[PDB]
Structures are given as structure tokens and as C-alpha cells.
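PROTOCOL LOG
Step 1. Enter all chains and additional molecules of the complex.
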Amino acid sequence: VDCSEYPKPACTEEYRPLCGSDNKTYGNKCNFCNAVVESNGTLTLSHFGKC
Amino acid sequence: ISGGDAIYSSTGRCSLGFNVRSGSTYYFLTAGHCTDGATTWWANSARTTVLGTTSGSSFPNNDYGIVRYTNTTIPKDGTVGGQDITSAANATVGMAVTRRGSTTGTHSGSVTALNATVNYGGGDVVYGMIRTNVCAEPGDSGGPLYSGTRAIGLTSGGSGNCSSGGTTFFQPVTEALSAYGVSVY
Ligand SMILES: [K+]
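Step 2. Run joint prediction.
Step 3. Record the structure below.
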């Protein structure tokens, strides 16, 4: 996952989990990538799937 | 299995919109983004209980898909959780609605705008959407939006979350029902 086309004003609501470096399970890459932007680039991908 | 319950494709989990039917043939509606590229649907994460296979999928542009039931024994309730649904109707500004979804469960709010355009990126744009102040989270796609006993829409997407508040856009269910020649029961 590449979050360069982010942010995006909206995300579909399907569930395919990603695990962030904050230990939060992100519901989908769209959710995950908007958080990376809001974090101003500090948040990273830990692994795919639930934390 | 009923409106708002989880559905599993080979890629992820979505929510069942509404159980619909045409003649003696049972289907269920869900979100297009969810039926796009999915073939088989199961009722559980272990993928041991089969629901059916995709019969149609419209996404982007619209945001609805339909699945034919191949399972003969599973109960197919014409409800949303326990909520009986008896007709479908058109959303209207100020209308009070409720969404049920496999992740967040039930939440209510109202319709704040119609004929909304949502741009999900890379060319995925959906048109003619119902805007509302109802929250939704990943898992909730395709779940129902109703008002009392009326079917109104299918969850497609948005921003925010249920803890801090959000805006979710829904596909009009009337559009899907007409396209497939199906009706709620
Ligand atoms: K959301």
C-alpha cells in the first residue's frame, strides 16, 4: 500500500483489515491511508490483517 | 440471515442490504463495490456456509449489486435484524432513517441531502446518492438504510466514524429494485 493519492474525501465501507504502527486495526486501506495523511506521515504499516 | 448481517466474499466482509425476490427466485442486494469482482458469498468467516453467487454488480456510477441465493435451507427473513420491511420508498430531505451494519450494528440519523456525488478516487465516482448524518465503518458496506418499515438505500461510504460522528452516503434502493426487476418481501 501507497498512500500518495491521499487524502480522499470518502471511503467505501468494505472490510479488509490493515494493522497500523499505532496498533490500531484500520478497516480498509482507504481508512488506513487517510490516517497516514492526518498523522502527517508518521503512522506506518505494520502488517496486513488485524493487529 | 437478514438485513445488516455479515456476508463474506473471497476478499473481505460486507453487509447484507435487503432480501428481495422475483417470482420464486431469491436474491439479496448489497453494495456494488462489494459484488465487483466477487463470485461466491458465504455466511461466515470460515466460509463454510454458502449464501449464493453474484448475479449482478453496478459500480462505480451506481453502487448496488445483487446475489442469487444457492443455499436452500438458510432462512431468508424479509427484515433488518428484527425490523419488518414492507415497502421501499424514496428518500427525502429531513427524513429520519436508521442504518444496520455488520460492524457497527444500528445507528440513526437523517437525510441531509439528495442527488449527491461521491468521488472515491481513481475514477470511482458514484452519482445520485443520498447524503446523511448517519455514521458507518468498514464492514458496514451494503447494509440497509430504512425508515420504519420502509426500505430506503444501501450503505456505500463516506467519512468519519461512529465515535466522533460522520456522513454516509447511500445508494437509492429503488434504483436497484427496478434494475433487477425484484421486490422486497
Ligand atoms: K466511515
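Step 4. Note key features.
The radius of gyration of chain B is 15 Å.
The first helix of chain B runs from residue 32 to 35.
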